[PDB]
Design a protein around this ligand. Structure first.
Ligand code: CLA
Ligand code: CLA
Ligand code: CLA
Ligand code: CLA
Ligand code: CLA
Ligand code: CLA
Ligand code: CLA
Ligand SMILES: CCCCCCCCCCCCCCCC(=O)OC[C@H](COP(=O)(O)OC[C@@H](O)CO)OC(=O)CCCCCCCCCCCCCCC
Ligand SMILES: CCCCCCCCCCCCCCCC(=O)OC[C@H](COP(=O)(O)OC[C@@H](O)CO)OC(=O)CCCCCCCCCCCCCCC
Ligand SMILES: CCCCCCCCCCCCO[C@H]1O[C@H](CO)[C@@H](O[C@H]2O[C@H](CO)[C@@H](O)[C@H](O)[C@H]2O)[C@H](O)[C@H]1O
Ligand SMILES: CC1=C(C/C=C(\C)CCC[C@H](C)CCC[C@H](C)CCCC(C)C)C(=O)c2ccccc2C1=O
Ligand code: SF4
Ligand code: SF4
Lengths: 73, 80, 141, 159, 742, 73, 41, 95
C-alpha cells in the first residue's frame, strides 16, 4: 500500500498531471483503472508477435513473479 | 523417538490406553486415585505421535502428554 | 507368562493386492499376527480388500505394527477373537510383542512397573531458561 | 477559506459539474416521447439533481479545486454539521443499542437456562429493556460511579 | 410383487418441533453450550442418514424434500413469467427483434439507482437480461402478455400443488420401503411416461401451435395481426394454408403414408436464414422420434406381468476371466444406498449439462439467439459451471457411500473389491499421465514465452514457426461436413455450420455462425483442457479410492468421512479425508472451467462473432488475433485480460456501473477467502480468548461461549468465499464486455 | 561519459553475455555508448560516487582493489 | 399457538424482522429526505 | 513361503517369505563373441576406475566448454556477432 501510494503520487507529479491523482485516488476503481491498468501498457507490450523491446526482460520478470506468487498458494 | 509422560493427576479411566493405535500405553497398579491404577508408557519407541491419547484424556489439563522429538522409520509411519 | 513361539499355520484366503509387503520387509522388520477362528468368515484386510479367515489357526504378514493392531482390534470388537502378533527381523529373530504379559494393556495387571510417570501436575514443570546449556528437557525432571 | 477552499456557491466547477450532469440527462431525454413514463422519470431525476445542488450550495460547504465538496472535522464552529452533530447522534444511538444489549444479557444471566434465552429471545423482557434505553448515558454514568460496571475477578491464562 | 404400499398418518402435524431447533439430532437436541452448536445445527440439517438407521424414514424424507425443491422451482418459473409479463418490453422486442434489447427487470428510484435503468429500446427502461427467455417465448409462439400472465398463475398453482403433495406424502400417507425399491417399475414409468409422453406432448404443441405462428412471424406478418393459437385448431383451413399436408387429416399416419407429412416433418440441417436458428420442422420430427424411442425403451424391464428383463440377472450374467465375479453384488448396493445413486446421477447430470452447453452454442435452437452474443456467452458459461459443480459432487457423495454404506461381506471378489485391490497402480499411472500432460503442454507455452522474449520467433510453436496441427480434429470436421452427400444422404445440409464445409448465415448485419478453423493454438488449448481434466480426476479418484484406509492410516474408515486430521504424528496427517480431497477437487474444477470459458470467449470473439457489411466482407470483434496471440501467456495477459477488461473498468456513470461494482466486490471477496484458507484455528481461538476477557471486564460476556470455527468449517468457508469471488469476477467481466460490444 | 553529461546519459550496470539470445535481443539491449548488450543501473551508485569526488575509472579500480584488501583483512 | 410464538422468537426470524423494519425505515427516510450529506441542524 | 499348503511364512526360507526374488534375472554366461570382448576389455577398460573417471570428466568438460565458448564463430552465436544496427535513443533523449 505504501509503495503504491508513493509511486502513483510521484508519477502524477512527474507527468505534471496531479489532478488525475487528486480526483481518482478517492475511490478504489480510480486506483485500479488509472494506476495499474493504465501504467501496465508498455510493460505488457515488452514482447509481442511484432517483435520485442528493451522492456522484454521486465515483461518476462513480471510474468515470472505472477507465476511464483501463484505457485506459493 | 517421541516421549510420553504421565502426570499424577490421572484418574485411571483407561481411555488413553484404549485409544492408542500402536500399544504404547498400559495400565499399572497405583495408589492415589479411586480406581487405584495409573497409566504407563513403556513402549515409547513405537509411538507415532498421533496424540489420540491426549484427545481421550478427561482432565482440566492433560494427565498424558506427548512431546514430539527425533523421527524414525517407525515414528514416520512408513510401510516402505 | 511364557511368550508363545511361531509355527506353520495356514494363511487367510486372499486373492492378492498391491498393498502388501515391500522391500522394507526384505531389508528391515515385518510383522506377523496370529489368531484362531471358530468358523470361516469374511473380514476386511487392513491393506484394502476382503479376505476369508480359515477355521482354526491363521497367520498374516503385515508391514506395520499399526496394521496388525488395527486388524486385531477389529477382530476383538467384532468377532470376539483373541490374537497375538510378533516382530520378525531379516536374520530370523522373532520378537513377541502385543500381549506382552498375556493381559491386554487396558486391564491392570500385577508385576507391571510404571514408566514415564511424573509425580506432579503438568503445571509444575520448570522453565526452559532455568535449564539453559543443559541437556534436560524440563519434562524429564 | 480553510486550507484555501472556496465556498460551493462561489466556486466554479461546482456549477460546471451541475451543468454537465443536467446536459447528460437531457441528452438521454432526447430519445423518448414527452408524455411517456421514461420522460417523467428522467425529469424527476433532473429536478432531484437541481434540488441537491441548490441545497449543497446553500448549506455552506467548502469546495476544492476539482469542484467537489470537502469536509472539515477539526472542531470548527462553522462546520459542526459536517462531523460533530452526526457523530453525537451516532454515539447516542450506538450507546443505546449497546447498553440495552448489555442489560438484556445481565438480566438473562440469572435464569433456569441462560443459553435457551440466548438463542430464543424473550420478547417481552427484550422490549422492556429496549424501551428503557432512552436515558442510557445517565444509567451508564450511574453504574460507573456505583462500581457495578466493571469486574475484578476474571479468568486469565498462565502469565 | 409391485404394488402400492403406504402407511396412514405416520407423523403428526404440529409446531412443537419448530420450537426445538435441534430435534432431528440426539446430541443437538440438548441445546447449545458453545457457538459450535449453531454451525452444527445448520450443517447437519438435511443429512438424513446420519440421524436414523432405518431406510424407510430416510426414503420418506428424501421424497418429501424433493417435492419441496420442485415447489421452489415452480415459484421461480412463475416469477420469471410474471416479471416478463409486467416489467418487460417483450411485445416491442417481438416487433423488432434485432434492435430492441431484451429487458425484464426494473429498479425503483431510491438512492440514485435510476442510472441502472438503461435505454434498451421500445420506449422502455430497465436492466438488459441475458437469460434468453424472450427467444424461448418467441419459439413457443407467445405473442401477448396475457399468455405469460396465465402461465405465471398456472406456475403458482403448481407450486401450491407440490407443497400439498410433499405435506401429504410425509405427514399423512408415507410410502413403505418396499415401494421405493421397485427400481424396475420406477425405470419403466419414468422412462416411458416422463420422457416419451412429455416429448410427444411437446411435439404436439409444436406441430399444432408453434409451426404456424413462427411461420407467419418469419414471413413478416405483424404480431398483432396473427391469429390466436386455438384458431389453428378450430379452423384447420388456416393450418392447411400454411402447411398443405394438414388437409389430409390423420389418414396418412394410420395408413403408413408418412411421406405425406414431409412439409412439416423435415430432416434438414443448418439454420433458418431469417432468424439464425434451427428449423422448427426438424425439431418436430425429432421430439416425435425421441418420444417414440423412449416409449419403446420404457417397456423393457420386468414387472407384475411376467415379460421383461430383470436387472439383477443381467448384472450377474456379465462377468469374465479378467474380473472374477464381475458385476455381481451391484444391485443390492444400488437398491440399498441413496448415496451411490446420488453419485451416479450427479456425474451423469453434470456431463449432460456440459454436452448441452456445447451443442447449444454449436446449433442455436432458438430464433434470434445466435446473433444475441450476450445470451450465447451467458448460457454457455452458466451451464458449463453447473456441470462442473455436479461432477465434483458425484465424487463427493461416492466417497460418502464408500465410507458409510460399504460392506465387505457382500463384496468379496466383484469389480468393486478388485478395483480397491489394484488402486496403487491406478493412482501411479494417473500421476504419470498428469505430469506428462502438464510438462508437454504448459512447458510448450513457457517455451513460446521464452523464445518470444529472446527475439527468436522462428523457434516457437506457432503456425508460422514450427507447427503442431490437429490432424484428427481437422479430419473429423471434413468428414462431418461431407455427410449430406455420402453417409447421411437424406439430409439437406450438415448438422451445424461449424464444420469446415458450409457457408455464412447473417441476421441483421451480424454473423450467426461460421466455419471454425483449427490450428496450432487449438491443439495447445485442447491439450491444456486434457491436462486439467485428468488432474481433477486424479484428485477426486485418489480421494474416493483411499477413503477407507491406506498405508499411512490403516483405520481411516473409523474416523469417518469428514474429519480434520489424525494428529501431527507420522510426519503430519493433515487433510487425509475424502472431504478434503473434494475440497481440493473444487479448486481444480474451478481452474479447468475458467480456462474452458476463456478459450470459448476469445475464440468466438476472434473468429466467429462480428459484423458483416455489403459485398459480404466480415469484420470480427478482435480481428482474428487468437491464432497469433494465444500461443503465449503474455499474449493472453495482454490481448485478453488487459484489452477486454476496458469495458468493465470504464462502466462507471453508465447503466453498466453495477457490473464494475460487482467486479471490484468479487476481487475483494476472493481476496477475503485467503485469510480463512491460509490460517489455522489456534491463533483465532487465542485472540478470541483475549476479546472474551475484554467483554468479561464489563460484565457483558455471552452465555453461549464463543469458539473459533472448526478446522473443516474453516476450509469450507475459505473454499466457498474463494469460488464465489472468482466466479463473480468472471461474471461481471463477461457481462460488461459482451453487453458493450455485442 | 555519464560524468560529462549527467542528464543525458544512461548509467551502465554490467555487460550481458547470454548464449541463449538471438540477434534482435542483442540489438535491443545495446544502450548507452556501449559496444554490446548492457544493463542500465538503477541503484544510484553513479550519483553517489560522482558526488564524493570519484571522477575516472582508475579511481573506481583503486577502490575495488582496496576493498578486496579489506575483505581479506 | 404457544409453539408458534416460541418459533417466531428464534434468532434468525427475529433478526429478519428487525433488519427488514430497519431497512424499510432507512429506505423511506432516504425517499423523503434524499441526498443528505451534512446535518442541517 | 514353504509352498506346501496355504502356509506362506517359513523362517527357514526368509527370502521366499519376504518376496526377495529376481523377476527377470538370467544367468546364462554366453552372450557375446570372444574377440569383441577382447577389444572392448582392452580399450574401454581404462575408464573402469571411478576417481580417475571423475577427474577426467571434469577437466574434459571444462576444457571443451571453454574452448567452444571462446572460439565460436560469430556466424553461429548471436552474442559473439554483436549489434549491427544504429542504437535507439531513450525517451527523454537519454542514451
Ligand atoms: C489533536 C487534534 C485536535 C483536537 C482534539 C481538537 C479539539 C477541539 N477543537 Mg480543534 N483544531 C485542530 C486540532 C484539534 N482540535 C487543528 C489542527 C485546527 C486547525 C488550526 C483546529 C481548529 C479548530 C477551530 C477553529 C475550532 C476548534 C475547536 C475544537 C473543540 C470543539 C475541541 C476541543 C473549536 C473550539 O474550541 O471553539 C472555541 C473551534 O472553533 N478546532
Ligand atoms: C424467484 C422469484 C422472484 C424474484 C427474485 C423476484 C424479484 C423481484 N420482484 Mg417479483 N414476483 C415473483 C417472483 C419473484 N420476484 C412472483 C412469483 C410474483 C407474482 C406473485 C411477483 C410479483 C411481483 C410484483 C407485483 C412486483 C415484483 C417486484 C420485484 C422486485 C422487487 C421486489 C422487492 O424488493 O420487494 C424484484 C426484482 C416489484 C418490482 O419489480 O417493482 C418494479 C413489484 O412491483 N414482483
Ligand atoms: C408416468 C408416471 C410417472 C411420472 C410422470 C413421474 C414423474 C416424476 N417422478 Mg416418479 N415414480 C413413478 C411414476 C412416475 N413418475 C412410479 C411408478 C414410482 C414408483 C416406482 C415413482 C417414484 C418416484 C420417486 C421415488 C421419485 C420420483 C420423482 C419424480 C419426478 C422427478 C423430477 C422431474 O423430472 O421433474 C420434472 C417435473 C415435471 C415434468 C412436472 C410433472 C407434473 C407432475 C409432478 C406429474 C406427476 C406425475 C405423478 C405420477 C402423478 C401421481 C398421481 C397423483 C396425482 C394421484 C417426476 C415429476 C422424484 C421427485 O422429484 O419426487 C417428487 C422422486 O424422488 N418418482
Ligand atoms: C399429445 C400430442 C398431440 C395431441 C393431443 C394432438 C391433438 C390433436 N391433433 Mg395432432 N398431431 C400430433 C400430436 C398431437 N395432436 C403430432 C405429433 C402430429 C404429427 C404426426 C400431429 C398431426 C395431426 C394432424 C395432421 C391432425 C391432427 C389433429 C389433431 C386434433 C384432432 C385429434 C387434436 C387437437 C387433426 C386436426 O383437427 O388438426 C387441427 C389433424 O388433421 N394432428
Ligand atoms: C441434488 C444434489 C445433491 C444432494 C441431494 C446432496 C445432498 C447432501 N449433501 Mg451434497 N453436494 C452436491 C449435491 C448434492 N448434495 C454437489 C454438486 C456438491 C459439490 C459441491 C456437494 C458437496 C457436498 C459436501 C462437501 C457435503 C455434502 C453433504 C450433503 C448431505 C447434507 C448436506 C447438508 O447438510 O446441507 C447443509 C447446507 C448448507 C450448509 C448450505 C451451504 C451452502 C446431503 C446428503 C455433506 C455430507 O454428506 O455430510 C456427511 C457434506 O459434507 N455435499
Ligand atoms: C463508514 C461507512 C459509511 C458512512 C459513514 C456513510 C455515510 C453516508 N452515506 Mg453511505 N455507503 C456506505 C458506507 C458509508 N456511508 C457503503 C458501504 C455503501 C454501499 C452499500 C454506501 C451507500 C450509500 C448510498 C447509496 C447513499 C449513502 C448515503 C450516505 C449519507 C447518509 C444519508 C443520511 O443522512 O441518511 C439519513 C438517515 C438518518 C439521519 C438516520 C436517522 C436514524 C434515527 C431515526 C435518528 C434518531 C452519509 C454521508 C446517502 C447520501 O445521501 O449520500 C450523500 C445515499 O444516497 N451511502
Ligand atoms: C547459465 C549457464 C548456461 C550457459 C552458458 C548455457 C549455454 C547454452 N545453452 Mg543453456 N540452459 C541453461 C544454462 C546455460 N546455458 C539453463 C539453466 C537451462 C534450463 C532452463 C538451459 C536450457 C537450454 C536448452 C533447452 C538449450 C540450451 C542451449 C544452449 C546453447 C545454445 C548456444 C548455441 O550455439 O548452441 C550450440 C550448442 C552446441 C553445439 C552444443 C555443444 C556444447 C557441448 C555439448 C559441450 C560439452 C558438454 C560438457 C562436456 C559438459 C561438462 C559438464 C561438467 C549454449 C551453449 C541449447 C543447446 O543445447 O544448444 C538448447 O537447446 N540451454
Ligand atoms: C394455509 C396453509 C396452511 C397453514 C398452516 C395451517 C396449520 C393448521 C393446523 C396444524 C396443526 C394441526 C394439529 C393441531 C394440534 C397441534 O398442533 O397440537 C395440539 C396442541 C394442543 O394444545 P392444547 O393446549 O389445546 O391442549 C393440550 C392438551 O394436553 C390438553 O388439551 O396444540 C393445538 O391444538 C394448536 C393447534 C394450532 C397450532 C398452530 C397455530 C397457528 C397456525 C397458523 C400460523 C400462521 C397464522 C397466520 C395468520 C395470518
Ligand atoms: C484394455 C484392457 C481390456 O481389455 O479391458 C477389458 C477387460 C475385459 O475383461 P473380461 O472380459 O473378463 O470382463 C468381463 C466383464 O467384467 C465385463 O463386464 O477388462 C480388463 O482388462 C480389466 C480392466 C483393465 C484396464 C486397463 C487400463
Ligand atoms: C386431446 C384433444 C385436445 C383438444 C380437444 C378439442 C379438440 C377440438 C378440435 C377438434 C375439431 C377439429 O376441427 C376440424 O374439423 C372440424 C369438423 O369436425 C371442422 O369444422 C368445420 O366443420 C364443422 C362441421 O363438422 C362446422 O361446424 C365448422 O363450422 C367448420 O369449421 C374444423 O374446421 C376443423 O379444424
Ligand atoms: C477469521 C477466522 C476465524 C474467525 C472467525 C469467526 C469467529 C467467525 C465469525 C462469524 C460471524 C462474524 C459471527 C457473527 C455472530 C452473530 C451472528 C452476530 C449477531 C449480531 C448482528 C451482527 C447480526 C476462525 O475461527 C478460523 C478458524 C479456522 C480457520 C480459519 C479461521 C479464520 O480465518
Ligand atoms: S501419541 Fe498416539 S501412538 Fe503415541 S502414545 Fe499417544 S495414542 Fe499412542
Ligand atoms: S496442523 Fe491442524 S490439521 Fe494438521 S495435524 Fe495439526 S491439528 Fe491436524
Amino acid at each position: 500500500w505504501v509503495t503504491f501510494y508513493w509511486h502513483w503520487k510521484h508519477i502524477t507529479l512527474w507527468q505534471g498531471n496531479v489532478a488525475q491523482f487528486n480526483e481518482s485516488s478517492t475511490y478504489l476503481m480510480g486506483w485500479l483503472r488509472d494506476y495499474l491498468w493504465l501504467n501496465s501498457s508498455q510493460l505488457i507490450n515488452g514482447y509481442n508477435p511484432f517483435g520485442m523491446n528493451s522492456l522484454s526482460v521486465w515483461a518476462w520478470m513480471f510474468l515470472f513473479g505472477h507465476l511464483v506468487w501463484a505457485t506459493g498458494f | 523417538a517421541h516421549s510420553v509422560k504421565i502426570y499424577d493427576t490421572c484418574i485411571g479411566c483407561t481411555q488413553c490406553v484404549r485409544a492408542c493405535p500402536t500399544d504404547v500405553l498400559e495400565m499399572v497398579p497405583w495408589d492415589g486415585c479411586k480406581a487405584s491404577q495409573i497409566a504407563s508408557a513403556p513402549r515409547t519407541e513405537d509411538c507415532v505421535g498421533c496424540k489420540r491419547c491426549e484427545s481421550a484424556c478427561p482432565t482440566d489439563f492433560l494427565s498424558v502428554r506427548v512431546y514430539l522429538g527425533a523421527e524414525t522409520t517407525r515414528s514416520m509411519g512408513l510401510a516402505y | 507368562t511364557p511368550p508363545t513361539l511361531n509355527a506353520d499355520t495356514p494363511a487367510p484366503i486372499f486373492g492378492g493386492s498391491t498393498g502388501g509387503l515391500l522391500r522394507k520387509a526384505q531389508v528391515e522388520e515385518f510383522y506377523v499376527i496370529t489368531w484362531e477362528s471358530p468358523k470361516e468368515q469374511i473380514f476386511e484386510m487392513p491393506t484394502g480388500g476382503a479376505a476369508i479367515m480359515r477355521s482354526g489357526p491363521n497367520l498374516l504378514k503385515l508391514a506395520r505394527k499399526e496394521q496388525c493392531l488395527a486388524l486385531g482390534a477389529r477382530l476383538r470388537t467384532k468377532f470376539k477373537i483373541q490374537y497375538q502378533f510378533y516382530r520378525v527381523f531379516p536374520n530370523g529373530e522373532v520378537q513377541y510383542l502385543h500381549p506382552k504379559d498375556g493381559v491386554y494393556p487396558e486391564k491392570v495387571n500385577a508385576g507391571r512397573s510404571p514408566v514415564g510417570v511424573n509425580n506432579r501436575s503438568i503445571g509444575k514443570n520448570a522453565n526452559p531458561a532455568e535449564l539453559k546449556f543443559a541437556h534436560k528437557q524440563a519434562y524429564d525432571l | 477559506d480553510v486550507a484555501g477552499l472556496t465556498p460551493c456557491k462561489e466556486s466554479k466547477g461546482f456549477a460546471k459539474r451541475e451543468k454537465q450532469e443536467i446536459k447528460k440527462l437531457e441528452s438521454r431525454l432526447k430519445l423518448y416521447a414527452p408524455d411517456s413514463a421514461p420522460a417523467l422519470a428522467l425529469n424527476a431525476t433532473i429536478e432531484k439533481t437541481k434540488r441537491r445542488f441548490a441545497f449543497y450550495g446553500n448549506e455552506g460547504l467548502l469546495c476544492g479545486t476539482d469542484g467537489l465538496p470537502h469536509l472539515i472535522v477539526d472542531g470548527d464552529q462553522a462546520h459542526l454539521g459536517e462531523f460533530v452533530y452526526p457523530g453525537l447522534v451516532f454515539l447516542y444511538i450506538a450507546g443505546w443499542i449497546g447498553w440495552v444489549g448489555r442489560a438484556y444479557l445481565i438480566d438473562v444471566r440469572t435464569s433456569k437456562k441462560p443459553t435457551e434465552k440466548e438463542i430464543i429471545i424473550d420478547v417481552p423482557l427484550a422490549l422492556r429493556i429496549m424501551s428503557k434505553g432512552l436515558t442510557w448515558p445517565v444509567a451508564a454514568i450511574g453504574e460507573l460511579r456505583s462500581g457495578k460496571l466493571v469486574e475484578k475477578s476474571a479468568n486469565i491464562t498462565v502469565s | 410383487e409391485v404394488k402400492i404400499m403406504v402407511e396412514k398418518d405416520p407423523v403428526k402435524t404440529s409446531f412443537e418441533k419448530w420450537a426445538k431447533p435441534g430435534h432431528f439430532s440426539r446430541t443437538l437436541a440438548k441445546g447449545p453450550n458453545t457457538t459450535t452448536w449453531i454451525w452444527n445445527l445448520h450443517a447437519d440439517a438435511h443429512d438424513f442418514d446420519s440421524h436414523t438407521n432405518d431406510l424407510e424414514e430416510i426414503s420418506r424424507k428424501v421424497f418429501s424434500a424433493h417435492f419441496g425443491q420442485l415447489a421452489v422451482i415452480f415459484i421461480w418459473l412463475s416469477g420469471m413469467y410474471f416479471h416478463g409479463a409486467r416489467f418487460s418490453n417483450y411485445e416491442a422486442w417481438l416487433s423488432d427483434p434485432t434492435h430492441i434489447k431484451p429487458s425484464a427487470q426494473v429498479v425503483w428510484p431510491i438512492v440514485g439507482q435510476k442510472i441502472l435503468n438503461g435505454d434498451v429500446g421500445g420506449g422502455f427502461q430497465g436492466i438488459q437480461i441475458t437469460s434468453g427467455f424472450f427467444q424461448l417465448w418467441r419459439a413457443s409462439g407467445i405473442t401477448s402478455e396475457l399468455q405469460l400472465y396465465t402461465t405465471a398463475i398456472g406456475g403458482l398453482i403448481f407450486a401450491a400443488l407440490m407443497l400439498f403433495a410433499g405435506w401429504f406424502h410425509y405427514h399423512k400417507a408415507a410410502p413403505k420401503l418396499a415401494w421405493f425399491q421397485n427400481v424396475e417399475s420406477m425405470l419403466n414409468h419414468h422412462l416411458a411416461g416422463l420422457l416419451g409422453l412429455g416429448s410427444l406432448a411437446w411435439a404436439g404443441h409444436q406441430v399444432h401451435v408453434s409451426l404456424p405462428i413462427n411461420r407467419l412471424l418469419d414471413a413478416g406478418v405483424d404480431p398483432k395481426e396473427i391469429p390466436l393459437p386455438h384458431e389453428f385448431i378450430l379452423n384447420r383451413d388456416l393450418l392447411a394454408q400454411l402447411y398443405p399436408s394438414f388437409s389430409k387429416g390423420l389418414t396418412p399416419f394410420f395408413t403408413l403414408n408418412w411421406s405425406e407429412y414431409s412439409d412439416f416433418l423435415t430432416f434438414r440441417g443448418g439454420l433458418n436464414p431469417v432468424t439464425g436458428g434451427l428449423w422448427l420442422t426438424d425439431t418436430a420430427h425429432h421430439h416425435l422420434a425421441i418420444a417414440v424411442l423412449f416409449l419403446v425403451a420404457g417397456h423393457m424391464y420386468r414387472t407384475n406381468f411376467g415379460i421383461g428383463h430383470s436387472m439383477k440377472e443381467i448384472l450377474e450374467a456379465h462377468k469374465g476371466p479378467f474380473t472374477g465375479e464381475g458385476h455381481k453384488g451391484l444391485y443390492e448396493i444400488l437398491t440399498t444406498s441413496w448415496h451411490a445413486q446420488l453419485a451416479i446421477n450427479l456425474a451423469m447430470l453434470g456431463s449432460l449439462t456440459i454436452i448441452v452447453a456445447h451443442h447449444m452454442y454449436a446449433m442455436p435452437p432458438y430464433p434470434y439467439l445466435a446473433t444475441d452474443y450476450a445470451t450465447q456467452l451467458s448460457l454457455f458459461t452458466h451451464h458449463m459451471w453447473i456441470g462442473g459443480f455436479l461432477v465434483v459432487g458425484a465424487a463427493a457423495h461416492a466417497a460418502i457411500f464408500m465410507v458409510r454404506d460399504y460392506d465387505p461381506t457382500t463384496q468379496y471378489n466383484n469389480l468393486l473389491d478388485r478395483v480397491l485391490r489394484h488402486r496403487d497402480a491406478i493412482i501411479s499411472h494417473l500421476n504419470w499421465v498428469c505430469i506428462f500432460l502438464g510438462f508437454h503442454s504448459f512447458g510448450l507455452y513457457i517455451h513460446n514465452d521464452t523464445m518470444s522474449a529472446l527475439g527468436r520467433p522462428q523457434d516457437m510453436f506457432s503456425d508460422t514457426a514450427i507447427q503442431l496441427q490437429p490432424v484428427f480434429a481437422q479430419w473429423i470436421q471434413n468428414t462431418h461436413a461431407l455427410a449430406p452427400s455420402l453417409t447421411a444422404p437424406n439430409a439437406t445440409a450438415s448438422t451445424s455450420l461449424t464444420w469446415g464445409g458450409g457457408d455464412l448465415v447473417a441476421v441483421g448485419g451480424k454473423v450467426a455462425l461460421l466455419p471454425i478453423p483449427l490450428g496450432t493454438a487449438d491443439f495447445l488449448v485442447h491439450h491444456i483442457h486434457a491436462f486439467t481434466i485428468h488432474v481433477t480426476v486424479l484428485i477426486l479418484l485418489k480421494g474416493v479410492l483411499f477413503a477407507r484406509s491406506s498405508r499411512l492410516i490403516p483405520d481411516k474408515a473409523n474416523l469417518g468421512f469428514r474429519f480434520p486430521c489424525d494428529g501431527p504424528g507420522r510426519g503430519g496427517t493433515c487433510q487425509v479425508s475424502a472431504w478434503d480431497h473434494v475440497f481440493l477437487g473444487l479448486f481444480w474444477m474451478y481452474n479447468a472451467i475458467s480456462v474452458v470459458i476463456f478459450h470459448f470467449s476469445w475464440k468466438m470473439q476472434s473468429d466467429v462473432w462480428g459484423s458483416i457489411s455489403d459485398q459480404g466482407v466480415v469484420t470480427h470483434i478482435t480481428g482474428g488475433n487468437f491464432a497469433q496471440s494465444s500461443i503465449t501467456i503474455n499474449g493472453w495477459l495482454r490481448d485478453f485480460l488487459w484489452a477486454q477488461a476496458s469495458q468493465v473498468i470504464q462502466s462507471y456513470g453508465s447503466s453498466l456501473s453495477a457490473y464494475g461494482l460487482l467486479f471490484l466486490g468479487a476481487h475483494f471477496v476472493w481476496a477475503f477467502s485467503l485469510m480463512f484458507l491460509f490460517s489455522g484455528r489456534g491463533y483465532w481461538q487465542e485472540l478470541i480468548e483475549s476479546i472474551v476477557w475484554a467483554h468479561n471486564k464489563l460484565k457483558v460476556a455471552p452465555a453461549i461461549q464463543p469458539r473459533a470455527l472448526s478446522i473443516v468449517q474453516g476450509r469450507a468457508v475459505g473454499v466457498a468465499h474463494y469460488l464465489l469471488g472468482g466466479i463473480a469476477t468472471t461474471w461481471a467481466f463477461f457481462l460488461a464486455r459482451i453487453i458493450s460490444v455485442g | 561519459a555519464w560524468g560529462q553529461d549527467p542528464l543525458h546519459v544512461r548509467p551502465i550496470a554490467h555487460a550481458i553475455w547470454d548464449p541463449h539470445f538471438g540477434q534482435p535481443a542483442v540489438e535491443a539491449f545495446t544502450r548507452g555508448g556501449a559496444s554490446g548488450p548492457v544493463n542500465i543501473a538503477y541503484s544510484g551508485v553513479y550519483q553517489w560516487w560522482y558526488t564524493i569526488g570519484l571522477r575516472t575509472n582508475q579511481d573506481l579500480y583503486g577502490g575495488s582493489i582496496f576493498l578486496l584488501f579489506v575483505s581479506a583483512l | 399457538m404457544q409453539d408458534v410464538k416460541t418459533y417466531l422468537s428464534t434468532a434468525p426470524v427475529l433478526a429478519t424482522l428487525w433488519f427488514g423494519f430497519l431497512a424499510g425505515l432507512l429506505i423511506e427516510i432516504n425517499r423523503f429526505f434524499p441526498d443528505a450529506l451534512v446535518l442541517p441542524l | 513361503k514353504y509352498g506346501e499348503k496355504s502356509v506362506y511364512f517359513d523362517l527357514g526360507e526368509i527370502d521366499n517369505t519376504t518376496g526377495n526374488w529376481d523377476l527377470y534375472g538370467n544367468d546364462d554366461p554366453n552372450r557375446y563373441n570372444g574377440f569383441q570382448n577382447k577389444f572392448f576389455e582392452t580399450f574401454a577398460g581404462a575408464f573402469t576406475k571411478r576417481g580417475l573417471l571423475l577427474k577426467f570428466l571434469v577437466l574434459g568438460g571444462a576444457t571443451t566448454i571453454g574452448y567452444l565458448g571462446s572460439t565460436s564463430s560469430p556466424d553461429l552465436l548471436a552474442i559473439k556477432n554483436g549489434p549491427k544496427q544504429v542504437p535507439v535513443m531513450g525517451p527523454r533523449g537519454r542514451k
